[PDB]
Amino acid sequence: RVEKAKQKSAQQELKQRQRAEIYALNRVMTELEQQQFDEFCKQMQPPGE
Amino acid sequence: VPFFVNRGGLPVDEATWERMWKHVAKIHPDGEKVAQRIRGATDLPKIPIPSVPTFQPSTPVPERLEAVQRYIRELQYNHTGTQFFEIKKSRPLTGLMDLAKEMTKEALPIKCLEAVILGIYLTNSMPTLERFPISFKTYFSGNYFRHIVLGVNFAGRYGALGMSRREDLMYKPPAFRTLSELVLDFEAAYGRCWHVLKKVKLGQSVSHDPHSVEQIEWKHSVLDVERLGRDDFRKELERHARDMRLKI
Ligand SMILES: [Cl-]
Numbered sequence: 001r002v003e004k005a006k007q008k009s010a011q012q013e014l015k016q017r018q019r020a021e022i023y024a025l026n027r028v029m030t031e032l033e034q035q036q037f038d039e040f041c042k043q044m045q046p047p048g049e
Numbered sequence: 050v051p052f053f054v055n056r057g058g059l060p061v062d063e064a065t066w067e068r069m070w071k072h073v074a075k076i077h078p079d080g081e082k083v084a085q086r087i088r089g090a091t092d093l094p095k096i097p098i099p100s101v102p103t104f105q106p107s108t109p110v111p112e113r114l115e116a117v118q119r120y121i122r123e124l125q126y127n128h129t130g131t132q133f134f135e136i137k138k139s140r141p142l143t144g145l146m147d148l149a150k151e152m153t154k155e156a157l158p159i160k161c162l163e164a165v166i167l168g169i170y171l172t173n174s175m176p177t178l179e180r181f182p183i184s185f186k187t188y189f190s191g192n193y194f195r196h197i198v199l200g201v202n203f204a205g206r207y208g209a210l211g212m213s214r215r216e217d218l219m220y221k222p223p224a225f226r227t228l229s230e231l232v233l234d235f236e237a238a239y240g241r242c243w244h245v246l247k248k249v250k251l252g253q254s255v256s257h258d259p260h261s262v263e264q265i266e267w268k269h270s271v272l273d274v275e276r277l278g279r280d281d282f283r284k285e286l287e288r289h290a291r292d293m294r295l296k297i
Binding site for chain 1: 061066077083084087093096128129133155156158
């Protein structure tokens, strides 16, 4: 029947959602890493003279 | 368990999907917070599918390389904590070329080894380009790290394709007069970030035959950096570069 047509559309939409979540997660993880490294650098900034 | 046990690609099953999110919660301090906001959003930015680059027959190789690297960049470095493609290094080339094709179709973030496989796949069509893996083993604080890039040689000059969090551990223009200088540019980068270089593994040039069944020779040369002299180190790299210049 045409179950395969609706099942393929379903597969494509969920593929697109899963990929969009992966990339939204990738962006967030990148910002966390940057944030944590920045805190680490702030902590050891030398006082100079 | 590979992310793609359900062979093929996306979408993955729930068991795999939840496992990725449980892992996110263990490596990020807010853990579940980030997942709540993404999994709970009813719309999320649309991420274009990066299009594999096409060339004019006349386009010079250094231009092709820029665009191959620009394509590899667009997939983005994988910060998610979950490795999406399983890559078995002792595996016939043609089977690694199938994997590369799927990476181009699924279009998910990648790390250094994926980038190397992709690099080979996207330059098999350039017969005047030599490709060969370069692996580094370094030490930083109580741990050993491994990184790999695709060394390339065009018109007697060396460069590299790859992926890293650092701009100076991946792409290099084909401008280095010698293999020792290419490798030295990576040693400088590792110096900058405080890693101690322990080993360099150089493989043989990789066949351009997308259907080859030979597996990649990842450690034709292994250079133990501490035990070799700086001068014997450079002589070893030049020996390997000669050995490669002969098998053509
Ligand atoms: Cl570039």
